[PDB]
């Protein structure tokens, strides 16, 4: 099932999943008070009770990421690098609605997130050229997805 499985603490951590493609969860120092186990699995639509609603010229871009543990609330940032076949990040906090996910920090503290981590960050067109999305959030919803438009 899972992409991503590692016990993270206040030091930070990070993992890239499995198939080795550009999915990797990054936990900064000091984002996680206690001994978390961090997981990230993806799910397909099908498998879901209420799938992410979209208009007619929206379609979705990447498989449903469901990261562990759900609901885990982060002292500040943590980000997610997603790979993908303009392009939104939704999410669904219990999996019944589906909103707009915007980091009200984004992009341009990304060195301020990072904590003096020692990980390596690849530009916005970096992550283009490989077709990965970067989510930055404080939190984990039960989902997210990425959707085009
Ligand atoms: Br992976
Ligand atoms: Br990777
Ligand atoms: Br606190
Ligand atoms: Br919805
Ligand atoms: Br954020």
Wanted: with cysteine.
């Amino acid at each position: 099932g899972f992409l991503v499985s590692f016990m993270v603490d206040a030091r930070g951590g990070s993992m890239r999943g499995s198939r080795h493609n550009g999915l990797r969860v990054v936990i900064p120092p000091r984002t996680c008070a206690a001994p978390t186990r961090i997981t990230c699995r993806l799910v397909k639509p099908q498998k879901l009770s209420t799938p992410p609603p979209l208009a007619e010229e929206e379609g979705l871009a990447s498989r449903i990421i469901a990261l562990g543990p759900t609901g885990a609330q982060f002292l500040s940032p943590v980000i997610v690098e997603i790979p993908h076949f303009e392009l939104v990040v939704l999410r669904s906090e219990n999996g019944s609605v589906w909103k707009e996910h915007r980091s009200r920090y984004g992009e341009s503290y990304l060195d301020q997130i990072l904590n003096g981590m020692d990980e390596e960050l690849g530009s916005l067109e970096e992550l283009e050229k490989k077709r990965v999305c970067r989510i930055i959030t404080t939190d984990f919803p039960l989902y997210f997805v990425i959707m085009s438009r």
